[PDB]
Amino acid sequence: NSVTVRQDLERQLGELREEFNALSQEIAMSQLIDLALLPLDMFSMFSGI
Amino acid sequence: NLPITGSMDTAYANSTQEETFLTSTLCLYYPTEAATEINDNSWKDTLSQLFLTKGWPTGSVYFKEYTDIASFSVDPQLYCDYNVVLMKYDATLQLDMSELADLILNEWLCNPMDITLYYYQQTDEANKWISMGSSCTIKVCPLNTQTLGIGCLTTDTATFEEVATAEKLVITDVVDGVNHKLDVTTATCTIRNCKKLGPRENVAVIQVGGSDVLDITADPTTAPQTERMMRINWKKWWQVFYTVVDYVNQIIQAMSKRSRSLNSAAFYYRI
Amino acid sequence: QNYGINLPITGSMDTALTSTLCLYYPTEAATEINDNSWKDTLSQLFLTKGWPTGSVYFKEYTDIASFSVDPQLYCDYNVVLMKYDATLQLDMSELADLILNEWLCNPMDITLYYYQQTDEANKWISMGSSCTIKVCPLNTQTLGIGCLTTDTATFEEVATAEKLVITDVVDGVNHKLDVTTATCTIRNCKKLGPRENVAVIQVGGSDVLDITADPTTAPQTERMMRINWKKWWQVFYTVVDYVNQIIQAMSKRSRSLNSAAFYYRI
Amino acid sequence: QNYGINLPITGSMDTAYANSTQEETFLTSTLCLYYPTEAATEINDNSWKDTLSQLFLTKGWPTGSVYFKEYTDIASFSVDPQLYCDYNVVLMKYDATLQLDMSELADLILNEWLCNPMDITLYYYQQTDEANKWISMGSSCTIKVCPLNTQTLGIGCLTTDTATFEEVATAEKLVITDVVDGVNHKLDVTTATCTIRNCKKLGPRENVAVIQVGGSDVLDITADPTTAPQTERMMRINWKKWWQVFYTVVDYVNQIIQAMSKRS
Amino acid sequence: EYIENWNLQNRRQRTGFTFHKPNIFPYSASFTLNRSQPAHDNLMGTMWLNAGSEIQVAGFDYSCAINAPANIQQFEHIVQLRRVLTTATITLLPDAERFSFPRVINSADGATTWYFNPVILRPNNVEVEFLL
C-alpha cells in the first residue's frame, strides 16, 4: 500500500548508441568468431542477460 | 543535388554586386521609435534615393515597421530577397531578442502540435517547440514509461512545470527522449514541433546598441556570432539608417540567397 | 606514478565510486521554481542522460557573495549556475578566478611580517565575513610610500567589506598589510593552472568574466558558458539536456581529496 | 626602418634574436596615464602620483617619465584629446548610457586621422570612401545634414530651410558622422561651439591603449556594421576600487607596452 | 636503352622504359563538392592535385561527419593513367600537405569564392587499389 512506485526513466537512445559503439572496440576477434558459430537461440541469448 | 566538380585554376568572374542589386529586393525592418525619432514623412523616399545612389533600383528597397521586438516575434514574415532587421537592444529582453534571432536567422521545418490529445517528446538537439501568439503560457509535465508524471500530475495542470508565461514567442527545449504533457493557452497561442535545418542566409540582424548577448543555439557550450549578426552603437536613428545604407554592399556580402524550397504560405516582395 | 612522471609518452599517429555531478544554483532559483520535489525530477531527467540515481547532487547558495566565502567543490564534476548582476561583475570574476583555477596558498601573518608578490602567478586571496584590505608599499629602506608604517589611516585601501577578494600588488615590492583578521583571513596564493572539473554557466547578462589579472587578456575558456534565461525551469532543462556537452568541456582529473577551492600548505 | 611603404627592406629568416629591449625602451620613453576625476576622488591621498611613479621605478621606468593626466569624464576628455607621451594608457570608466560616445572616443584616439578643415557655410561636402568621416568636436556639436541630388536640390529637405534638415548630432562633445558616399550634403553645425573636420582614417594609432574599467565589450571603432574588431590595444578589466586598477596597470605595464608600438 | 627499345618495337617485341619519377599524371588541381550550398558553409567533398608522379588528395567534411550514418564520411579518388605502368614503386603517406592549410578557392563556375580551414585527422580505412 502506497502511491504507485514510479519506474524511473531508463536512457535516451542516443546515449545507448554511444555506449554500444564505445563497447565495440573491446571485442576479441578469435573469440568473437568462436561465438559467431554457436547457434544462439532464444534461450541462449536471453539467459545471459 | 549533384556532385559539382570544379577546377582550382578557373578565373574569378566579375563583380555580381551590381547585378544582384538590380535583380533583387531589400527589406529593412525597424522599430516604430525609429520613425518617431526621425519625424519625417518622406524619409522612406530619402532612403530610397540614397539606396539608388548605392545601386538599388527604385522600388526594390521595401521598408517595414514593427511595434517592438515582442510584437514582431509573432510569425515574423520576411518578404524581400535580402532582409535586414534593425533590432533595438533592451537589457531586460535579452532572451526574447535572442529567440527572435534564433527564429529568423535559421531555417525551421515545423509541424503542428495537437497537445490536448497527444503526448510529445523531443528526439534530438535540433528539435525544439516554437510557440507563437498573443500570450503563450506553456507548462510542461515530464512523464515516464508508466505514463505517470515526474513531480507533476497529468490530471492537475497546477503541478505542471512553468516554462513560459505571457510570451509572444518562446522556443522551448526540454530533455530529449522523455514524453511530456503540455498545457498551453491554445486560444492565444500556437505551438509547433520544429527542427532547425541550418542558417537562413538571407536574413541579417543588426542589434542597435548594447553588447553581444544573442545566443541562437540552445547548447550552453556555444554562443556563436555569425556574420549575419551585426551590432552597432547608436544615439540617433538617422545615423543608424545612414550607416545601413552606406555599408549595404558589406551587409549583403554577409548574406546569401535563401536557397531553401519551402512548403509554407508567405507572400514575398520580389523583382 | 611520481617515479614515472618525468618520463616520455610515445604514441603513434597511425594507430586507431563512479562519476558524480554537483549543481550549484542560487537560492532564488529554487524560490522561483517553488516546487519541493524538483530535485527528484531533475535527478531522473539526468538519469535519462546516463547519470545513476545517487550521482547528481544539488547544492544551494544564497548569492554570489556568500558562496564566495571559502567555496567547496564536492563532486567529480561541478557545474556552477551563477546569476549575473551588473553591479557584482568583479566579484563574479573573482569567484570564477578562484573556482576555474587551481591555487596553492600559504598562511599570511600580516601583523608580524611584510609581504611581496614574487611573480604574475602570485596573488593574495582573502575570504570571510568581511575583508578590508589596506596596503602600504615600502621601499628598500622599509619606509612606506604615500603611507606611514605606524599610521594605518594612511594605508591605501584596496578592498572594503569583501566576502572574497583577490589582491594583485606590484611585484618585488614589500607591503605592510592591514586586514580585518578577526572577520576574514588572507593567504598568499599561487595559480597553478586550470581546474578542469569545474564549469561556470552564467545565467543571463553578457560576457564579463575575467579570470586573469593581466589586463591584456580576458580568455573565455570552454568551461565558461553563458545562457539567456527567463524561467529557471528552462535553465535547468537546458543544463540537463546538454549535460554531455558540459562534461565534454570538463575533465574528471582535477578532483582533489578535499573539497576546498585551494591547496593549503604551511 | 621607420614607415617603409616607399622602399623595400630585405631580411633573412636566420638572423639571431636581439636581447630584450624592454629595459632600454623603458629607459628612453615616457608613459602617460589618463584617468577620470573619479579615480582621484576615491584616492584621497595627495601624493598618489608620486607613489605610482616610485612603483613604476621599481619596474624599470626612470623617475622623470611616468605622467598622470586627469580628465573630468569621457564627454569632456573627448574634446580634442591630446596624447603627448610615447606610450599612452587611457583608463576609461564604463557607463552603459554613453556606449557610442565611448566608442567614438576610442575610435578617435585608437586610430590615426588625416583631417582637413570644413566650411559648411561656403561649400557642399561629400564622403569619398569608407575611410572618410566627419569628425565634429567642441562644447556642444549639433550637426544637421541635408543630402543633395545631382541637381543640387535637397532630398527630403530644403537647402534654404534648415529646420527641414536631418539631425545627426545634438549637443555632442564629439561625434563621428558617416553619410552615404557620393552624395553632396548641405551641412548645418553650431560653428560657434563646434568645429567639424573632414577626416580620413589612415590606420591604427599604435601608441594609445584604452583600458575599459568595468562593463563589457561594447567598443566599435569601425563604422562598418559587419565588423566590430577588438584590437590588442583595447583592454577590459573588472573593478571595485581604483587603487586596485592602478596597481594592476603598474604590475602588468610590460604587457600593456608590448601590446603597443612606440611613437614614430 | 632507347635504341634497344626502338629495335624491339621494330621487331614487334615487348618494350620497356625505366622512369625515375615518371611524368605520367597531367597537371590538374581540381575539387568536387558532394555536398554544397550557395553560402559554402557546410561543404563535403575532396580536392586533389595530380602533378608529375605525385597525387595529393584530401577529403573534407565541414560538419566532421556529425550527421553521417556511422559518423564516417567516405572519400574516393580515381586517377586514370594514360599508359600502363609496371614494376612501379610508390610511396604512400597519410597526409596531403597541399590541402592542409587555410585557403580561398574559387567556386566551380567561378561565380564566387569559398573558405577552407582544414583541421587534419588521420585517414581511416585507407585502401589503395591499382587496376589494369
Added chain:
Amino acid sequence: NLNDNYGISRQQAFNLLRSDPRVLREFINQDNPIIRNRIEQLIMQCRL
C-alpha cells in the same frame, strides 16, 4: 591482397571463398594483418 602478399594454399583459398570459420580463425590467430583488418572493419560496421 592476401593471395598476393601471402601465397595461400589451395585448401585455404577454397575455405576462404566459402567463408569457412576454421580458416578464418587460423588466420586471425596467426596475427595476419590483412584478415584481422578486414574483420575489424566488419566489427566496426556493427553500429547502432
